[PDB]
C-alpha cells in the first residue's frame, strides 16, 4: 500500500485536515496523522481537537512517504513554515521525487522552505500575496493545480477535489472514481 504523512499543527484548518485523511483512508492509503508539536491533541482553527496518530518526531523516522500533506489554516501554515523538522521532511521528499500536497494557506510553507520553486501553484485567495512574495511560483486560480510533484488547492470547499487528486496520483484514476461515488459529490 501507499503511505501518506499528514502534518498536523495548532491552528490547522480541521476541514482541510480531516477530508484528505478520511478520503485517503477510503482509498486504502496508510495515513499517519503526525502532530507537529508532539503526540498531544491538537486544537485546530475552529476549535475541533484532533488526537494525532504519532508525533512528527516519531513519524519522520518511519519515512519515507508517498505523499506529504500540508493542511491549511493561516496559523497552522505559519507553524509549519517555522518548523525545522518540516523543512527537512519536505526537502527530502522533493529530493526523492515524492509527491507534496498542500491546501489553502498550506502552500505558503513550501515558500518558507524553498520547495518547488518555479512550479505553478494555487492557494486560498487570501494567501496569494504571501505565496507570491518574490515571484518564486506562477499563480493559478484552478481549484486544484498539479505541476509534477507539487499538488496544491484552494480551500475547505476544494478539499474533496484535492483529496481525490492525491488518490489519483498514488492509486490511479479507477480507485479515485470508486472512492468518489459513495461521497455524494456534486
Amino acid at each position: 500500500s501507499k503511505r501518506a504523512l499528514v502534518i498536523l499543527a495548532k491552528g490547522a484548518e480541521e476541514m482541510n485536515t480531516v477530508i484528505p485523511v478520511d478520503v485517503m483512508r477510503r482509498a486504502g492509503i496508510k495515513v499517519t496523522v503526525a502532530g507537529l508539536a508532539g503526540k498531544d491533541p491538537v486544537q485546530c482553527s475552529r476549535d475541533v481537537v484532533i488526537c494525532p496518530d504519532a508525533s512528527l518526531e516519531d513519524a519522520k523516522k518511519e519515512g519515507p512517504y508517498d505523499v506529504v500533506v500540508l493542511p491549511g489554516g493561516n496559523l497552522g501554515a505559519q507553524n509549519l513554515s517555522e518548523s525545522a523538522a518540516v523543512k527537512e521532511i519536505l526537502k527530502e521528499q522533493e529530493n526523492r521525487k515524492g509527491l507534496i500536497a498542500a491546501i489553502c494557506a498550506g502552500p505558503t510553507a513550501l515558500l518558507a522552505h524553498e520547495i518547488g520553486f518555479g512550479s505553478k501553484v494555487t492557494t486560498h485567495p487570501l494567501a496569494k500575496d504571501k505565496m507570491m512574495n518574490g515571484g518564486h511560483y506562477t499563480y493559478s486560480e484552478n481549484r486544484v493545480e498539479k505541476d509534477g510533484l507539487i499538488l496544491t488547492s484552494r480551500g475547505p470547499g476544494t478539499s474533496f477535489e484535492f483529496a481525490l487528486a492525491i488518490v489519483e496520483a498514488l492509486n490511479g484514476k479507477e480507485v479515485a472514481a470508486q472512492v468518489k461515488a459513495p461521497l455524494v459529490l456534486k
Copy 2:
C-alpha cells in the same frame, strides 16, 4: 448567539461531523461537540480521533439548543439510534419546535426514536431502505431536504450545503452567504 449540540458517537463519519462544527462556528454559532459515551476521545469511522467539548450527559443539562445535529456514519448512527439519552434529547427538541439536523445515515436515528414522522427526508443512498422501513417518511433525492424543523442531507459531499442550510435556518441568508464565500465552494 444561537447554540448547536452536535452528538458525537464512536463510528461517526468525521467529515460529516467536522464540516458542520467548523461552518457553524464560522457563523458565530456556539457549538458544543458532545460525546455520546462520555468525555473521552472518540474514534470516528476512518479512525480520526476527536476530543469532545463535553460529555452528552453534561451537555444535555445545558440545553436547550437551537439545533441538534446528528452526523452520519453507519456505526455512529447505530449508536445514536440505541441511546436513551439521544431519544430524550430529540423528543424534547421536537416538542419545543427546535431544529433537528441529520446527515448521511444520521436520519435513521430519527426513525429509531420516532421523530418527525410524516416528514420529507433524504439520507445517504445506502441508508434509504433502513430509513423507509415502515413508510414513516417520504423520501427525497435532494442534496439537502428541509421539511419544517427536520433538516436532512445525503453524504460527505453534501456536508457544506447541509451546514450552510443550518446556518441559514438559525442566522439567516446573509450570514450564510458571508460564511460561504471564503470556503471556495463550487
